[PDB]
Structure 1
Amino acid sequence: MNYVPELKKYYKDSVIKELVKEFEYKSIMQVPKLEKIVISVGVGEAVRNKKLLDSAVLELAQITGQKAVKTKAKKAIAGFKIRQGQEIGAKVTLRGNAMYEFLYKLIHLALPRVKDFRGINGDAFDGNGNYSFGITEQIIFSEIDYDKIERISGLNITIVTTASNDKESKALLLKFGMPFSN
């Protein structure tokens, strides 16, 4: 059995058809879809505290399911007293089935558990179908336990879509039921 995420089932069985009708696309897979979700977290203070970076990496692992990579400093800078090549950030890429499952978990479970959650700004679009927005308290995810955290942390989420514009991606996200603050 090719086990399939419920999001993938929902997409393939409805969303393709509604978007074809709604945007008069000539051929079927002119329809937008999702290629990757990038979860990033920038801990510049890790240059003092290694525990911060280790905790962030581990908490990302529990949140998603796959291990993270610690990015390095592209350029040595003094304003943040950064030496080139130091460990500064940590990111995870989600694709395919894991991507769909994580987005389902997020939209239905973790966005609800945010303090004063009143939707998400439906305008954080880079003009090319890529939607990036932040979450300040990772504790919204029930996966991580409260006691073991060493410092409350946030993280940025970027959703990359095959769409050529923002309208297409916003329509796809709305069909997915993404709680945009509107």
Structure 2
Amino acid sequence: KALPRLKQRYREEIREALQQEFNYANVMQIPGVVKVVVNMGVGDAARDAKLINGAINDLALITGQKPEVRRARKSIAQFKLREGMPIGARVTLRGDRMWEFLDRLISIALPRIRDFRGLSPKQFDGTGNYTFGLNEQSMFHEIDVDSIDRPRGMDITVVTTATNDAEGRALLRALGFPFKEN
């Protein structure tokens, strides 16, 4: 009785496109998207612990759910990092609100990147999951640019049931990701 816009498009069009393109023997082999993970690595927090709270608020507004604070598992003197220090914030998106975040990202957030020339199509990890980084948080309309204290980037990974980069690239391409041509 409901469906996120991008999910409907996937089930009705993209599945059929992939079956015609790669000619899978079984329908269970059709690649889909499992989860989207958004990670902010505030290494600076190892000294200025106030910074963690900004990264948390930004991710909460961007994704719509409370981040989980990730503690350092390993002391390292060069970074002034002690084990157990809160040094990262992560959000795991699944299901309906993963399809909504993806739709907002592809439609609104990515075209707002300053001097956006598309994403590199070579950022796949060999198993056909895609990761890309952002340097700032201003390209999200859920964050008030009037209120940001400091530019806070993040790493966004889309993980896929694709077995290889070619299949995963085709899926994201059909999903509307703006890839460069090389």
TM-score by length of 2: 0.97
d(CA) in 1 for partners of 2:78, 2:122: 31
Contact 1:52-1:150 within 8 A present in 2 as well = no
Shift of 1:50: 2.4
Structure 1 position 55 matched with structure 2 position 54? yes
The runs of 4+ residues in structure 1 deviating greater than 4 Å are none
Structure 1 position 30 matched with structure 2 position 29? yes
d(CA) in 1 for partners of 2:145, 2:103: 22
Structure 1 position 65 matched with structure 2 position 74? no
Q: Give the equivalent residue in structure 2 for 1:135.
A: 134
d(CA) in 2 for partners of 1:51, 1:85: 16
Contact 1:37-1:158 within 8 A present in 2 as well = yes
Deviates more, 1:49-58 or 1:151-160: 49-58
Gaps of 5+ in 2: none
Structure 1 position 96 matched with structure 2 position 95? yes
Query: What whole-Å deviation, never above 9, does each CA across 1:119-142 have from its counterpart, x for those lacking one?
Result: 000100110011111011110011
Contact 1:131-1:160 within 8 A present in 2 as well = yes
Percent sequence identity is: 50
Report the 3-state secondary structure (helix = DSSP H, G, I; strand = E; otherwise coil) of the residue aligned with 1:93: strand
Shift of 1:147: 2.1
d(CA) in 1 for partners of 2:18, 2:28: 10
d(CA) in 2 for partners of 1:150, 1:172: 37
How many pairs are equivalent? Answer: 181
Gaps of 5+ in 1: none
Query: What whole-Å deviation, never above 9, does each CA across 1:37-64 have from its counterpart, x for those lacking one?
Result: 1100111111222221101100100011
Report the 3-state secondary structure (helix = DSSP H, G, I; strand = E; otherwise coil) of the residue aligned with 2:36: strand
